[PDB]
Design a binder for this molecule. Structure first.
Ligand SMILES: [Mg+2]
Ligand SMILES: [Mg+2]
Ligand SMILES: [Mg+2]
Lengths: 146, 62
């Protein structure tokens, strides 16, 4: 799956909502303005962290080329597939490749940026599609890798 | 142990996936409705950036 000319025009559109001063760069101040305009309340350490991990050139800001590679890659690259897969094995203590839906719903509503009951309900419905209480995280990763 | 970083990375994967154009979800846009198409791309760009932060935080626990 590759990128069409239309979605590039939509990617520039969204890029220009971050780059509100129109100089072709996104700073932590521009990004923080968009996020807090969407109800978020991030700290600059988080704002600086969000810019750094997508700052390919390392110049401190996000230009449209970096923004374009970020939106087209999604979580489909090899580094992301291996890392997302390794993140699921941390809870696959049986070593078989399966994680109980009750356990996964429990950890996702108690650790990290915990999902709420509405969010986790939609996730378990797609993690345990057949409804047997078990999650094939290898098939679940490739589902969201696409 | 990498329990919390792995949990946070999985959380960013779902929120990014649930927000994607070919996906359907109402709990990933809780209290966010009738959104402009560029507005949805902006939220998708934010959640993708959160994912790369989570992946870097989880990798550094190795
Ligand atoms: Mg700018
Ligand atoms: Mg840059
Ligand atoms: Mg199942």
């Amino acid at each position: 799956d590759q990128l069409t000319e239309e979605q590039i025009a939509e990617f520039k559109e969204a890029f220009s909502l971050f780059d509100k001063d129109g100089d072709g760069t996104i700073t932590t101040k521009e990004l923080g303005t968009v996020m807090r305009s969407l109800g978020q309340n991030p700290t600059e350490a988080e704002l600086q962290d969000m810019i750094n991990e997508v700052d390919a050139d390392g110049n401190g800001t996000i230009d449209f080329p970096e923004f374009l590679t970020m939106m087209a890659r999604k979580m489909k690259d090899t580094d992301s597939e291996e890392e997302i897969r390794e993140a699921f094995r941390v809870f696959d203590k049986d070593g078989n490749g399966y994680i109980s839906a009750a356990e996964l719903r429990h950890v996702m509503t108690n650790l990290g940026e915990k999902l709420t009951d509405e969010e986790v309900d939609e996730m378990i419905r797609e993690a345990d599609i057949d409804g047997d209480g078990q999650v094939n995280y290898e098939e679940f990763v490739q589902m969201m890798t696409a | 142990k990498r329990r919390n970083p792995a949990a946070n990375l999985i959380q960013c994967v779902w929120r990014s996936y649930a927000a994607d154009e070919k996906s359907v979800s109402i709990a990933t846009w809780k209290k966010l409705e009738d959104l402009t198409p560029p507005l949805k791309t902006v939220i998708r760009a934010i959640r993708i950036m959160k994912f790369h932060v989570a992946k870097r935080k989880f990798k550094e626990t190795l």
